[PDB]
Design a protein around this ligand. Structure first.
Ligand SMILES: Nc1ncnc2c1ncn2[C@@H]1O[C@H](COP(=O)(O)OP(=O)(O)OP(=O)(O)O)[C@@H](O)[C@H]1O
Ligand SMILES: NCCc1ccc(S(=O)(=O)F)cc1
Lengths: 436, 431
């Protein structure tokens, strides 16, 4: 009767496939079999230590301002968390999600996100990148800048790093402490050499903490997870998936729904007072042949933010290419009363102009700048202005959606007013710098 | 430094030799010889007694249809050299047939996960995003065989270009096009892995040039399939340890060549295959995002591993111009609603697979079990289809309506009552 995978505290040595009884968070008992384990954690697959208890998160608002390991133990030299509640972490705990669509605005402070691919409360918007690109730097800037403008609910951040180096850990820790962002954040840091099982538990501890804060304390919580790919690397070598090939015989069935137990955990929480939003980092692995991992495409259902090496090589930060980027729920979180009435129009116009300008880079290479029309030259130049002024921003520059929109209107000014076909006259008259 | 311009080798040249290139308008741009094959010179442009070269030309003629050529345009089918009625500069700087018009009508691919949920539109650029070991080429071949433009007064044609392929893949491609009759309306450009690197980079330009000629001078809707861009980028890797900086601008000279042509009686649509390398150390992963501006079709390992063909995951897939090409008079009035409803239902079902693995199968509500099962039906009956199964948009929509009857009518939040009463199987009238 193979079923859900749970995590239980290890109190004694246990053997692979050992039958055990588990005392769950809700007080009920489960029958299961052991799959793998670390010094403090064992992975069990439920059916229907000999008699153990589930690994739990010491749920408490005191988690905020703390930096913990993947298993919830202090890394900041502080005392262990004094729990207000001990919650199971596999996702069965509170059943906090409402059947409501994601909808309001979350200000990341990054123009290429807030302006053209708006992140909304309850959404899961992955950052798609690759080795060598600054995705962690982007994840860190969002963590310290993110807020929920005009909201009556408090805002919190759950930052979860997986399989990182000592240097990286140092990097992250010092930043949260120096900026003060730590006061409104719970940080879970899993090192590359920490037990694999601990990496697997890391995203679950994070999400459980997120759900608790969102549901128990009516907060809008932003969960940043980096990097799924590293999570997937530990997963493929854990338990019964060990030395097994995906799609073949012997590959554990749970191996293909595992990522789903993570991306299913996002959304507005019951009561509609809080919510859990996810920003997972999906870094393209360069070893699909040697290290086959679970398909990560399942995490992409509401869009994605694309990090491009092209912009990175041009010396632009953050190197986000808005063209292949998308936020399917964007229309929920923008407009009058959320951002500003002209948000959709400006974003639409910048996208159109930037896409045109980029195509023109090809034409100019085909016929020469001397042969390009005046009109086309304007768009060609607009693409440069967009990348140089809108896309590019400092690592410590936190732009309000108003700043983002103004920069947008400023560069749009470079195009002929008669070429702004994506902006209704009403807005052109009201916000265009020439009629303002 | 780029950009790259191809010139016919009319006289001996040397590396770094400064030369003048005769543009199709009588003017001349100057560059430097970067590399060259025996008949083609690759020049990098800037901005008497020196070489003045002619741009490499494509022997254009409707007689191109039904022919299998090499990346350089030479017969590979044993047939005679193409008798041109026009010599077209393959760099694209001689005609520019594109209209200032947005892509708009329907292109029926016959594949449900494309036509139904992320529709291909005439003049659009819709890449197939895949990876090593996946069947993107089989999907590409199927589209080439089945694609059409229902109700269009303009004829339809296919331009299929393969870069750096093996001899076995070539034979396999030539065989399919020939036995199905698909070759009858196609111009096939085949470049083999051993062919000079120079011929590999001219291949897509020869293809796009043939496409523009048919579309603009013969008022045809042309579908251009390029598989793949990664091999193309590999050829650029070393022409004169990642890819050269000019690659990004170079790729732009390819993706700018798409759209409705002047007169709006024709168009060029591109379906480039972008497969990610299975190994980065040797085959670094290039940034081909410049080609992705109108969406993409995602081939997913998950579906392939489950034994489903075509393994297309609609959730991450997207067609930004879909609304242009659907609805009454194009496909059917209920298209957008069925598409929205299936997408939402599939996404919900997939999330529930997550919940099932958290609380267990028997813990799911009856309602949730309904969606969980719909996800299975979607993959088993909508996604899955034969490699030779050409579905009309009607078949696709009807298959959609059938699996949707698994969901509670009160759950079809994406379909307004008017379409429910008219098309829902439980309400539709016999007629
Ligand atoms: N699981 C997935 N795997 C691959 N591609 C996906 C997946 N899900 C969605 N996509 C699509 O692929 C695109 C991401 O690939 P993209 O071209 O951005 O790579 P990249 O980040 O530019 O690589 P590079 O490291 O060279 O910059 C997105 O536009 C998205 O639409
Ligand atoms: N790698 C070979 C480059 C090359 C090859 C041939 C020439 S010659 O074409 O002018 F006949 C010039 C340069």
């Amino acid at each position: 009767i193979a079923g859900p995978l749970i995590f239980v505290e290890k109190t004694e040595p246990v053997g692979y496939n050992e039958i055990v009884n588990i005392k769950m968070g809700d007080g009920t008992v489960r029958r299961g079999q052991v799959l793998d384990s670390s010094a403090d954690i064992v992975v069990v697959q439920v059916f229907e230590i000999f008699t153990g208890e589930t690994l739990k998160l010491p749920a408490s608002v005191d988690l905020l301002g703390r930096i913990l390991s993947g298993s919830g133990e202090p890394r900041d030299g502080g005392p262990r968390i004094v729990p207000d509640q001990l919650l199971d972490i596999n996702g069965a705990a509170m059943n906090p999600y409402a059947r409501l669509p994601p909808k309001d605005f979350i200000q990341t402070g990054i123009s290429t996100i807030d302006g053209t691919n708006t992140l909304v409360r309850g959404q899961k918007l992955p950052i798609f990148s690759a080795s060598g690109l600054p995705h962690n730097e982007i994840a860190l800037q969002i963590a310290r800048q993110a807020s929920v403008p005009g909201s009556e609910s408090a805002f919190a951040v759950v930052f979860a790093a997986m399989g990182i180096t000592n240097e990286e850990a140092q990097y992250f820790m010092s930043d949260f402490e120096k900026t003060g962002a730590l006061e409104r954040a719970v940080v879970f840091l899993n090192l590359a050499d920490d037990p694999a099982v601990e990496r697997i538990v890391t995203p679950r501890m994070a999400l459980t903490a997120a759900e608790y804060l969102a549901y128990e304390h009516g907060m809008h919580v932003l969960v940043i997870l980096t990097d799924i790919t590293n999570y997937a690397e530990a997963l493929r070598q854990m338990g019964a998936a060990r030395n097994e090939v995906p799609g073949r015989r012997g590959y554990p069935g749970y191996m293909y729904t595992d990522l789903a137990t993570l991306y299913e955990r996002a959304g507005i929480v019951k009561g509609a007072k809080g919510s859990v939003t996810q920003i997972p980092i999906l870094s393209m692995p360069g070893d699909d042949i040697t290290h086959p991992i679970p398909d990560l495409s399942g995490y992409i259902t509401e869009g994605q933010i694309v990090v491009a090496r092209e912009l990175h090589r041009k010396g632009i930060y953050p190197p986000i290419n808005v063209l292949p980027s998308l936020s399917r729920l964007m229309n929920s979180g923008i407009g009058a009363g959320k951002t500003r009435e002209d948000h959709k129009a400006v974003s639409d116009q910048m996208y159109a102009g930037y896409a045109e300008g980029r195509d023109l880079r090809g034409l100019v290479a085909i016929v020469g700048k001397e042969a390009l029309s005046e009109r086309d030259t304007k768009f060609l130049e607009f693409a440069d202005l967009f990348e140089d002024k809108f896309v590019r921003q400092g690592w410590n520059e936190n732009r309000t959606i108003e700043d983002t929109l103004e920069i947008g209107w400023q560069i749009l000014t470079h195009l002929p007013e008669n070429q702004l076909g994506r902006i209704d006259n009403k807005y052109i008259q009201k916000y265009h710098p020439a009629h303002r």
